[PDB]
Every structure is written in structure tokens, then in C-alpha cells.
């Protein structure tokens, strides 16, 4: 049993060159999803807001496919996220380096599908003026590829509703709305689109 | 004598590929235990509390067994934690990357048991409202594998009572109760269980 897995990981990683990133010929679709845990700091003196969340990333590579029947009917395995290529999805308006709060371990399926969910703490630009009121305040931060256009990495969500079921029950803040929306952007110069997922969270201090 | 140990380490590590983690076929039981040292910070403005503790981890691999009579009657040895596979146990509600306060050295015994106790400082979600009162306040944080279900990593404790014998005698806080309880979670969608150990501490400022 363990023999199959040791053999499988060897054939995928050592037997092959590493996936060189997508192109226009061999594009790649990445599905993104957020699970907010808590808004842990709000700084009105700098307009900086801190989130703790789970970032779900799922993509599919053909170079990661294998036949379960050739490897002891193994359909999936777990491996360090450093061992594999990962997409360059970034919050465009972060103000400090994202802090990783979880292990960075990816799970590969025999169809070449990969799911990767690092827990992270993010500080980003947001004027919280109005948080201490009934109306609240809205913050927004876009996530997207840093160097890949829409012709090379397709971004999309499974739902527009942010997962709020694990938000800390006794947090200092109440979530009024939280959405994750796929957006397409074109520029007059250029035919290729540029895609982002707009994370929009409306919240207020809780009384 | 000392030559034997180098040979033992050779046969276990450089002979075999790295243990690739458990599988549903070959599950693994991990024993969890905490020895709480101190509650070192309470931030009521952000609902963030800092603990300093020892996290005792024990598991058993068949691939690390050896015959004591075959290696100069050596029954145990110490080795760096990077050298061996270690479980991805994580506090689910941490707010900052865990800080390690100790060397990361594991001790392996001839029956395949490994025990590993990193000292750590953890910031996690807790509303401390009530800490300066007679009733005190309770904080809780769940620990479990990040990517392995219960069918792959079995979580177990040796006692439901957290070790408080090393709690700082002159701490700013008094421990009212400290328990470590195994919890199993099932989902309507899915047959496999998901296990966590709930560390629940009730405490108050010292009067």
C-alpha cells in the first residue's frame, strides 16, 4: 500500500519536469472561495483592516493525472504545497505581507485536480469611518493573478456568498454582508481581459 | 557504541523514502497532550489572547521500528523534527503564526513511537469579557489535522485534564479549569468523521 504512494509521488514529481505555468495554448482555470473567520483589527488611524480567513484554491493540471488502477487504486494523496506549482493569486490592496496561519499542504486527485486551503491573516486598505454606527462600513479588496492575464488564468467562484458559518461568534464585529464576485476588466488598448474576484464585506461594531 | 547510532539512523532514513503520510488504507493514531505554562496577554480591544504551552505529540510508525539487539541495545534516540514526518496539527482559530519557543527535536523508540513536544506561543480568538470578575471567563481553541480526516489520522488524548503543574506561580491570571476533550464532527454530506481536540480554559485575573 505505502509502496504504491511512494512510487506515485516519484513518477509525478521526479519523473517529470515541473509544470511551467499556463499559457494561451494550455490555459488554466482556478476556482476561488473565501471562508471568513474574524475581523481581528480595525485601525482608523491608518485605514487598515485585518482579516483571518480560509482561502480555498482549486485548479486542475493534466500533468498531475494518474491511473488509480496502476497504483493500488489510490485516488488521492496529500503533499506539501511547496512540492507543486501554485497560482499567484494576490490581494491587490494588501498593506503588509500576508501571514500564513496554517500548514501549506495540498491534496491531489487522480484526475489532476488540486485543492489548497491556507489559513491567512491579511491587512489591507480600508477606511473604517462609520464602523461605530448602525449603518456600518464597507471594505473591499480584489484578488487576482499578478502576472497572468485572463487568457492564461481563468478566475471564477462557485458561489457569490462568502462562507460565514465559521465566523467567530463573539467577535468584536458583526458581518452585515460578505460577497465574492467574479469581475472582468478590459482596457481600450488591449484585447485580453483581466479577471479579479471582488471580496466585499460590510460590517459594524456589535452592540 | 556511538557508531551503532549512526548506522541506525542510516537504515531508517537513507534506506527508505520519507513516510508519505497516512492513508485511508494505513491510518495513524496520534496522541495529543498539553502542558499549559502561562496566559501572557489579553487584548480585549481585539479579542485576542496569547498562550505559552507545551504541545506533546505521540504517534507510532511501523517503518521506524528496529530490533534493539541488532543495534547495540539502543532503545531510543533523538533527531531533528525536520528529519522526520510530523503531523499537521493546527489550532483552528489562531490569529497569528504560532511562535516556537523550544528546539524541535523528536525522540524515537525501537517500537516505532515518536514523541515531540514543541513549546509554542499562540494567539487565538477569545472574547475576554469577564476576566476581571469572580466568575472569570472561558476561552476555547480546537486542534486537529488540517488535511487528514479521522479515517486517516486518529486523534486521542491520554487524559482530559490539562497539565497545570508547570503554570507560572506568579502569573497575572489564575486557572479555574483547563480540559482537553476529543471531539468528533460528522457532516450530512459525508461519511468520514472529522476529529479535533478542544482545549477549554476558564480563568480570571488574580486577586
Amino acid at each position: 500500500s505505502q509502496a504504491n504512494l511512494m512510487r506515485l509521488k516519484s513518477d509525478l514529481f521526479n519523473r517529470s519536469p515541473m509544470y511551467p505555468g499556463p499559457t494561451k495554448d494550455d490555459p488554466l482555470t482556478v476556482t476561488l472561495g473565501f471562508t471568513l473567520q474574524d475581523i481581528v483589527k480595525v485601525d482608523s488611524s491608518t485605514n487598515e483592516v485585518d482579516l483571518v480567513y480560509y482561502e480555498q484554491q482549486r485548479w486542475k493540471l493534466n500533468s498531475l493525472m494518474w491511473d488509480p488502477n496502476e497504483y493500488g487504486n489510490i485516488t488521492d494523496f496529500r503533499t506539501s504545497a511547496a512540492d507543486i506549482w501554485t497560482p499567484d493569486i494576490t490581494a491587490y490592496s494588501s498593506t503588509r505581507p500576508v501571514q500564513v496561519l496554517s500548514p501549506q499542504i495540498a491534496v491531489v486527485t487522480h484526475d489532476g485536480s488540486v485543492m489548497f486551503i491556507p489559513a491567512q491573516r491579511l491587512s489591507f486598505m480600508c477606511d473604517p469611518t462609520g464602523v461605530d454606527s448602525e449603518e456600518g462600513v464597507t471594505c473591499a479588496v480584489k484578488f487576482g493573478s499578478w502576472v497572468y492575464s485572463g487568457f492564461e488564468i481563468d478566475l471564477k467562484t462557485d458561489t457569490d456568498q462568502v462562507d460565514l458559518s465559521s465566523y467567530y461568534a463573539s467577535s468584536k464585529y458583526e458581518i452585515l454582508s460578505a460577497t465574492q464576485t467574479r469581475q472582468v476588466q478590459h482596457y481600450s488598448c488591449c484585447p485580453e481581459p483581466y479577471i479579479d474576484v471582488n471580496l466585499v464585506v460590510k460590517f459594524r461594531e456589535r452592540r | 557504541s556511538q557508531a551503532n547510532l549512526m548506522r541506525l539512523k542510516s537504515d531508517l532514513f537513507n534506506r527508505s523514502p520519507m513516510y508519505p503520510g497516512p492513508t485511508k488504507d494505513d491510518p495513524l493514531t496520534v496522541t495529543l497532550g498539553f502542558t499549559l505554562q502561562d496566559i501572557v496577554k489579553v487584548d480585549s480591544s481585539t479579542n485576542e489572547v496569547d498562550l505559552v504551552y507545551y504541545e506533546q505529540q505521540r504517534w507510532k510508525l511501523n517503518s521506524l521500528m528496529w530490533d534493539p539487539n541488532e543495534y547495540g541495545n539502543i532503545t531510543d534516540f533523538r533527531t531533528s523534527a525536520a528529519d522526520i514526518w510530523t503531523p499537521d496539527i493546527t489550532a483552528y482559530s489562531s490569529t497569528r503564526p504560532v511562535q516556537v519557543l523550544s528546539p524541535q527535536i523528536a525522540v524515537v523508540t525501537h517500537d516505532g513511537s515518536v514523541m515531540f513536544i514543541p513549546a509554542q506561543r499562540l494567539s487565538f480568538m477569545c472574547d475576554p469579557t469577564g476576566v476581571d470578575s469572580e466568575e472569570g471567563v472561558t476561552c476555547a481553541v480546537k486542534f486537529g489535522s488540517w488535511v487528514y480526516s479521522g479515517f486517516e489520522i486518529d486523534l486521542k488524548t491520554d487524559t482530559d485534564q490539562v497539565d497545570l503543574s508547570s503554570y507560572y506561580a506568579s502569573s497575572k491570571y489564575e486557572i479555574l479549569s483547563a480540559t482537553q476533550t476529543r471531539q468528533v464532527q460528522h457532516y450530512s454530506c459525508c461519511p468520514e468523521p472529522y476529529i479535533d481536540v478542544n482545549l477549554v480554559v476558564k480563568f480570571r485575573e488574580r486577586r
Binding site: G33, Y54, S102, V107, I117 | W146, V147, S188
Partner: peptide, 16 residues
């Protein structure tokens, strides 16, 4: 509720 649990999400990518 599975789709909120990190380990649960990955073993069921068809649901989450």
C-alpha cells in the same frame, strides 16, 4: 457545513 471545514472541503471537491 462541510464546506467551512478545510479538511472536509478537500476530500469532497465535487460538493465544495
Amino acid at each position: 457545513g462541510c464546506c467551512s471545514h478545510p479538511a472536509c472541503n478537500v476530500d469532497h471537491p465535487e460538493i465544495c
